[PDB]
Paper text:
From biosynthesis to assembly into nucleosomes, histones are handed through a cascade of histone chaperones, which shield histones from non-specific interactions. With its dual functionality, DNAJC9 integrates ATP-resourced protein folding into the histone supply pathway to resolve aberrant intermediates throughout the dynamic lives of histones.
Our truncation analysis identified a HBD (amino acids 171–249) located in the C-terminal part of DNAJC9. To prevent disulfide cross-linking during purification Cys243 of DNAJC9 was mutated to serine, which did not influence histone binding. Two copies of DNAJC9 HBD-H3.3-H4-MCM2 HBD quaternary complex are found in an asymmetric unit, which are almost identical with a small root-mean-square deviation (RMSD) of 0.47 Å. DNAJC9 HBD adopts two α helices labeled αA and αB, each about 30 residues long, which are connected by a loop Lb. The αA helix of DNAJC9 HBD interacts with H4 L1 and H3.3 L2 loops, while the αB helix forms an antiparallel coiled coil-like structure with H3.3 α2 helix. Interestingly, the N-terminal half of the αB helix sterically prevents H3-H4 tetramerization, which otherwise forms within the MCM2 HBD-H3.3-H4 complex (Huang et al., 2015) and the nucleosome (Luger et al., 1997). Moreover, the C-terminal tail of H4 adopts a helical conformation following recognition by DNAJC9 HBD, distinct from the conformations observed in other chaperone-histone complexes (Elsässer et al., 2012; English et al., 2006) and at the nucleosome level (Luger et al., 1997).
Numbering used by the authors:
A (entry chain D): 172 to 248
B (entry chain F): 18 to 101
C (entry chain G): 65 to 124
D (entry chain E): 58 to 134
């Protein structure tokens, strides 16, 4: 059963299914990309990620400020 | 008294990683996403817990208080995204 | 190999959001209920710890 | 709050990780809670950035490749 020809057919089927899934992933990814509002290109991706990094930095700053205002000896007195 | 904890990285189950990804907006995940997530979180936790334990040790205590973790996270915020 | 992407918003997703009382609460082992010997770090202690940690990081 | 990681597995994992640094240790519950909140915020932000990196590459299925790409953009290694 595991002949060389049977392996060729399996490999071709898997390659074609991979191309199909790649096209489906590309369509869904464009749909989501416009659904999220990110401009096309690589630099837009980096800019959005770094803006989110700044936002998360300020967020954890606020979080640690809360932790200090609740558990520190300076806040208690 | 030599009790040891082991293989609790599996405590981060597949549903846990799925909830994290859905909170992050992920629609579909790869099969090998779970192991990568476990490794990333383990490295993160190791690097922050070492500093928290160092703070507790310098406090001449043996219990990690909340301010130990606060200072560990504050020190981590300076080195985590320093591009290396 | 290279199977389909595992969907995350499929049906039965509420199974990932079931409540488990055995795991949704912290256990008592390893926690500090005796609420002293939890004194905050003094400035000397904190500075010494941080400088030792920076030396250790340089060593790596 | 919402459910991302269950509290008992995270507590066991934190204690397992910590026992390799000091032998016998206790933890304030607020310390474990802050650890969990910081870890979950970090992981959800990393997942958002990974999803951005995946949809840039014409995919809605995230992969460890996209995770490492997002980490490299954020400034981690």
């Amino acid at each position: 059963v595991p002949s060389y020809n049977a392996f060729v057919k399996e490999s071709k089927q898997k390659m074609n299914a991979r191309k199909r899934r790649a096209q489906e992933e590309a369509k869904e990814a464009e749909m989501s990309r416009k659904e999220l509002g990110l401009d096309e290109g690589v630099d837009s991706l980096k800019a959005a990620i770094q803006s989110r990094q700044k936002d998360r930095q300020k967020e954890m700053d606020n979080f640690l400020a809360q932790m200090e205002a609740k558990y520190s000896k300076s806040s208690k007195g | 008294h030599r009790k040891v904890l082991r293989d609790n990285i599996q405590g981060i189950t597949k549903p846990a990683i799925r909830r994290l990804a859905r909170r992050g907006g992920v629609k579909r995940i790869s099969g090998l996403i779970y192991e990568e997530t476990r490794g990333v979180l383990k490295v993160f936790l190791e690097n922050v817990i070492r500093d928290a334990v160092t703070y507790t040790e310098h406090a001449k205590r043996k219990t990690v208080t909340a301010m130990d973790v606060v200072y560990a996270l504050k020190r981590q915020g300076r080195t985590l995204y320093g591009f290396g | 190999e290279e199977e389909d992407g595992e969907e995350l918003i499929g049906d039965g997703m509420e199974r990932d959001y079931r409540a488990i009382p055995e795991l949704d609460a912290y256990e008592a082992e390893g926690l500090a209920l005796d609420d002293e010997d939890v004194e905050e770090l003094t400035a000397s202690q904190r500075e010494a710890a941080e400088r030792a940690m920076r030396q250790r990081d340089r060593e790596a | 709050t919402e459910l991302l990681i269950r509290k008992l597995p995270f507590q066991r994992l934190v204690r397992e990780i910590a026992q390799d640094f000091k032998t016998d240790l206790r933890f304030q519950s607020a310390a474990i809670g802050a650890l969990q909140e910081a870890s979950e915020a970090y992981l959800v932000g990393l997942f958002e950035d990974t999803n951005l990196c995946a949809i840039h590459a014409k995919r809605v299925t995230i992969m460890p490749k996209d995770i490492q790409l997002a980490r490299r953009i954020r400034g981690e290694r």
